[PDB]
Amino acid sequence: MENFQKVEKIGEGTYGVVYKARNKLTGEVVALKKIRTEGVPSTAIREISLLKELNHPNIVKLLDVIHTENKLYLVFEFLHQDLKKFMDASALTGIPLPLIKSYLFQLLQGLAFCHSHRVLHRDLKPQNLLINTEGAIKLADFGLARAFGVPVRTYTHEVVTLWYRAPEILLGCKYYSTAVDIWSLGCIFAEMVTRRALFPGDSEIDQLFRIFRTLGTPDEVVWPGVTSMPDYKPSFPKWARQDFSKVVPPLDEDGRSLLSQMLHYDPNKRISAKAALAHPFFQDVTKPVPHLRL
Ligand SMILES: NC(=O)c1cc([N+](=O)[O-])c(NCCCO)cc1NCc1cccnc1
């Protein structure tokens, strides 16, 4: 690196390889993502650059956008662990409710900020939620999906996770709204509670049908306009809705109520991040210290 010294390979993101690196001058430790293919669109450059101004305590700071040697690198603030790893580490005992609540509350504040600035994530997942020893959790990769357009894959033929995708995306809607992020966060909230993914689909249709089997096959009553969606088929099986008491036991009624509002089929009926912050579920929210082993 011209100014960095790769510490280690953090992993293989959806856009490219990511390294933990140290700025040789400032000495700061950061996450360096090499972006994937042969030109680097200027449209993307301007858009990404805009994200450098999107600063909030629950949003991973984009420190720099480096377009040199016709290559694109994104420099982000570094956090030591992601929520997917934390959940696996907490699988035996489960993340305590107070911490689940603190994290959900912080993530909603982050979404409320991004959404008020007209920035969507579009691909939220546990691996994109980073945590530190102080009890903070931050959203990573906000705005990259729109700026870089179609995702497709990573760069090493890795399989795209569909588990957190909103039904309107699965049904072929071409215009995303802030609601897609609320849906993904609801799926993550449920996973923290039960310690099992809510809708672990292994294909686009399996993803959609897992959603239908749990929440009921949507119709014009609960989702006006659904039968006119691009990929909707009248031949979809019609499953009856299950009770939330069976979907996220043993979450209390405040929790089930909030989750039900984050998983409404109609994106327009889905609760906003701002409104969710006011839900009675957060009446007793606090900020616990997580047991993090680094
Ligand atoms: N900004 C960051 O700090 C960061 C960035 C990305 N990324 O993709 O830009 C990332 N990839 C998620 C892959 C998980 O291995 C993980 C990060 N930190 C959490 C972490 C740090 C060290 C080891 N395991 C997890």
Nearest to 136 by CA among 83, 197, 195: 83
This PDB structure is determined at a resolution in Å of: 1.8
Measured in degrees and rounded to the nearest 5, phi and psi for residue 218 equal -65, 150
Report how many domains make up the chain.
2
Among the three residues 15, 46, 80, which one is the final residue of a domain in this structure? 80
What is the rounded distance in angstroms from the CA atom of residue 2 to the CA atom of residue 23? 10
Q: Both 103 and 237 in a single domain? A: yes
What is the rounded distance in angstroms from the CA atom of residue 7 to the CA atom of residue 32? 10
Q: Both 282 and 178 in a single domain? A: yes
Give the length of the chain. 294
Instruction: Given the residues 123, 181, 231, 284, select the one marked as catalytic.
Output: 123
Q: Which domain holds residue 182?
A: 81-291
What is the rounded distance in angstroms from the CA atom of residue 14 to the CA atom of residue 160? 8
How many angstroms separate the alpha carbon of residue 282 from the centre of ligand 1?
28
Q: Both 231 and 145 in a single domain? A: yes
* 8 Å CB contact between 55 and 143: no
At a CB cut-off of 8 Å and minimum separation 6, what does 222 contact? Answer: 216, 264, 265, 266
Question: Does 33 appear as a known binding residue?
Answer: yes
- Alpha helical stretches, state H, the chain: 42-50, 83-89, 97-116, 144-148, 167-170, 179-194, 204-215, 244-247, 253-262, 273-277
Nearest to 70 by CA among 93, 37, 103: 37
Q: DSSP string of 118-138?
A: T---S---GGGEEE-TTS-EE
Indicate which CATH number applies to the domain containing 281. 1.10.510.10
Indicate which CATH number applies to the domain containing 56. 3.30.200.20
Cα 202–257–180 angle (5° rounding)?
A: 45
